[PDB]
Amino acid sequence: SVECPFCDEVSKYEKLAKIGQGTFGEVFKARHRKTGQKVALKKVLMENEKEGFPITALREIKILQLLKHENVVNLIEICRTKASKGSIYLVFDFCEHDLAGLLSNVLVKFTLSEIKRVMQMLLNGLYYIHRNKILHRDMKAANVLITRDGVLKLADFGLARAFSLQPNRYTNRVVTLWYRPPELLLGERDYGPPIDLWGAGCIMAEMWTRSPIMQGNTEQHQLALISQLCGSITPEVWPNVDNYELYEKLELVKGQKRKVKDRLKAYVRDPYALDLIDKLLVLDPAQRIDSDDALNHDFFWSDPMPSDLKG
Amino acid sequence: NNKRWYFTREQLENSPSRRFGVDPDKELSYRQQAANLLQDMGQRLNVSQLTINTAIVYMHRFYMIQSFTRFPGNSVAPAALFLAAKVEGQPKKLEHVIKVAHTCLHPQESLPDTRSEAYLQQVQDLVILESIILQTLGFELTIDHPHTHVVKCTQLVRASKDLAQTSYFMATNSLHLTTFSLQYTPPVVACVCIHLACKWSNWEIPVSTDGKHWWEYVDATVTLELLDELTHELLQILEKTPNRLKRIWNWR
């Protein structure tokens, strides 16, 4: 009826499986009817959307179209479905594994040189998106995919947002709880890329521990668990932390440990690995290692050197 | 495609609107009109000129696919502005855009009972049209904002506030009054506006110490023969437009 040359109908894909199996939302595996190509379909949720096409959807789509890189998920196109009362699908390239389900699986085994590559790819991905003035804001094992040719992809830019540098007033409930950084828990609203690098640390560790390292239940109960690993939240250790409103929640103003290294030595053998992890899981965001200096850390430049993937 | 939304004069002539019997004349008029409605509503809605500009670009591209005979400017423009403001992060509530669109288009008429069918419909009608705008554009909404290119390249020719202001003016009006945005890259257009602003201001940019002209430092395709053809064209429609030129005319 209406001319529509640049938005094909999603029926070009054959649905196959609810790949979230609950846990991603309404997200399907699917097969391009002519080529065989496998893809992921996300329906743009329209429940309680009173203000037309959702702004958060528009934002994600803007971001995905910008971010084009070997280690970021690829948005192929956006698809409609013919009305009479109609919907919109984001169409990603299908990735066969994700790092959560790979760590979960006991038959899967990670050699050191592989683990280096996984991290190398992840930080490269982070370098890119931050270089493009964008915060991911949802780092977690589950959102880190790997292709059958062993190429890692950052995925789920659903709560991603553009950033820059009056203070910045950014949404504070962001990042899953177990991978959420200190700053955000102490109510920080002008933050940037360090929040993702914090996440990369919890993931890095998880690559040996095979399970998320800091499984809290609330803001305070999380921030407790963090304090029981990275020291406690001292202005000595983090210049100006006192200045935060939410300072002295249950935050034991005395009860500190010292090191991450100790509780992880048991699992992480390599001396160089532990060191990277420590400069990533730093309390002060402005003294946390960055994407760039992290990639240059001797972990990625010593033996066994980083290698391609099968396991 | 990187050149999907760029067209030749040949292509523009065979628009979807010509195809339903609309003179070239009438079409550029309908375009100019939707820009005015957009600028008017944008001002009352207190959105940035950028947001208006984004909305105008959507409108220009929209009508390279759809014909004005099937979607009128008065219908599209609020939907397009509604969207633009969300895309550029100055989102305006849907009610609010409907009210402001109404008073713009029907100043004397009364604001309908915001509980009626007449209203609950013209609310659904907009949301419907926004959806159609998105699909016609194939969800490509990041616009290359033509003001940055002009501000960039006024300072690369060390211009006064006056020559700067005059250029920005030419650029804004080139959006409303021409289909240059649908033919020439934001840098080429910027060069056009700066060039004209100089002619209008009797200013001359000195030929560079290399022997080359100022505009080669922005975009390598820009030739004096082109700039003269375009600044002529822009100036003609500026002369046609009542009181436009008055705003930048030297009265003193």
Ligand SMILES: Nc1nc(N[C@H]2C[C@@H]3CC[C@H]2C3)sc1C(=O)c1ccccc1[N+](=O)[O-]
């Ligand atoms: N492109 C791709 N491929 C996938 N494959 C899944 C199937 C297996 C389970 C998780 C992975 C491995 S998920 C996936 C998405 O990027 C994806 C697409 C839409 C919504 C959310 C996601 N998301 O959170 O990953």
